[PDB]
Design a protein around this ligand. Structure first.
Ligand SMILES: OC[C@H]1O[C@H](O[C@@H]2[C@H](O)[C@@H](O)[C@H](O[C@H]3[C@H](O)[C@@H](O)[C@@H](O)O[C@@H]3CO)O[C@@H]2CO)[C@H](O)[C@@H](O)[C@H]1O
Ligand SMILES: OC[C@H]1O[C@H](O[C@@H]2[C@H](O)[C@@H](O)[C@H](O[C@H]3[C@H](O)[C@@H](O)[C@@H](O)O[C@@H]3CO)O[C@@H]2CO)[C@H](O)[C@@H](O)[C@H]1O
Length: 324
């Protein structure tokens, strides 16, 4: 189950988020709720939420023009300290002016929780008055220091595409095993060699699996199913379809193809008066690999998320006729 106390993800720049004060469950709004808030309009906490409400969307910006800043999505205004310098009890406001070093703001992780902090300072974002459960329209201010009641959750507010997942080949660990299976015995009780068909079913013992796992939670919305190629054995690509939620720290995959058979039917020449069986050796690669996810916004912005790919894949298989 999802717990923000351990699982709140760090937001990726360029992506739309809602911002929620964890302990009150309130969202960060421009005071008054406008899609076009006025310059020096205060950021406040308010219970009000609808997924369709663009006035509640925020985007972290980190580039040459705006290094460590925070943008109101619907207006394009930046989050500034009222008056233009961070200090004690400076109200967070929107303003249609570029960010500066003295306005920098980002989400940070401190002791296992996520906070808003003015970069290169000990000033963090507090509800004015410092209530752990502030009421609607409580303004957000900079103030020195943090504590758990101040934590925020950046909830993803748009749906991204998964373009590819590239494993870090130097950190990939592979453990190989052989799964060995035997058919029913077949006897040729005649005095002449005989063509016979020996069949065996192995669905249960050759089951493939795969998953992505995350330190906090995945933290991004990509829809109910996505498919990518992953190197489940050496560099060999196998398509895996994943179904999960932004809140999951483990996203289960379904391995979509197999290089091996789970129903075997072998044409055997059985010598006179001999008994034989088929032996099936199937190789299994259990793999763990740190990887980088390559994602993309509808607007064409390319973002990255680190993960770990864990998998079990049956990849080569051999069939031998053996005496009983
Ligand atoms: O407050 C954040 C803002 O501080 C500095 O801007 C100056 C004032 O502090 C700010 O109050 C003032 O706001 C103007 C806005 O420019 C006008 O369109 C109009 O909407 O009235 C308000 C007054 O409420 O603007 C001045 C500078 O023009 C920083 O320069 C700015 O970047 C932010 O950090
Ligand atoms: O507002 C965030 C702040 O709330 C609590 O602090 C109290 C007041 O809310 C805060 O305004 C007040 O600030 C003092 C400041 O300590 C003094 O140095 C001087 O500037 O006066 C202001 C009042 O304008 O401080 C009190 C607590 O003394 C929380 O305790 C604090 O941690 C923040 O979350």
């Amino acid at each position: 189950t999802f717990e923000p106390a351990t699982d709140s993800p760090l937001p990726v720049p360029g992506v739309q988020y809602f911002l929620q004060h964890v302990q009150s469950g309130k969202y960060v709004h421009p005071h008054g709720g406008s899609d076009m808030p006025g310059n020096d309009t205060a950021l406040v906490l308010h219970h009000g939420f609808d997924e369709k409400r663009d006035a509640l969307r925020w985007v972290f910006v980190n580039d040459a023009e705006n290094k460590h800043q925070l943008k109101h999505y619907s207006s394009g205004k930046f989050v500034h300290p009222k008056g233009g310098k961070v200090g004690k009890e400076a109200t967070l406001v929107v303003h249609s002016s570029p960010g500066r070093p003295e306005t920098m703001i980002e989400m940070v992780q401190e002791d296992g929780r996520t906070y808003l902090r003015h970069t290169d300072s000990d000033y963090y974002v507090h509800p004015h008055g410092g209530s752990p459960n502030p009421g609607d329209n409580t303004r957000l201010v900079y103030y020195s220091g943090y504590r758990p009641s101040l934590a925020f959750l950046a909830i993803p507010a748009e749906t991204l595409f998964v373009d590819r997942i590239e494993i870090h080949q130097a950190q990939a660990l592979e453990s190989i095993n052989t799964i060995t299976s035997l058919s029913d015995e077949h006897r040729n009780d005649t005095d002449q060699p005989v063509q016979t068909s020996i069949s065996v079913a192995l669905e249960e013992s050759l089951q493939d699996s795969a998953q992505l796992s995350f330190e906090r939670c995945f933290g991004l919305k990509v829809g109910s199913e996505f498919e990518v190629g992953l190197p489940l054995v050496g560099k060999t690509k196998v398509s895996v379809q994943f179904s999960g939620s932004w809140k999951s720290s483990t996203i289960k995959g379904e391995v979509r193809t197999s290089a091996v058979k789970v129903q075997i039917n072998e044409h055997v020449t059985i010598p006179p008066g001999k008994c034989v069986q088929i032996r099936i050796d199937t190789r299994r690669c259990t793999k763990t690999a740190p990887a980088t996810m390559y994602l993309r916004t509808a607007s064409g912005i390319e973002v990255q998320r680190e993960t770990t790919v864990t998998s079990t894949y049956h990849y080569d298989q051999e069939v031998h006729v053996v005496p009983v």
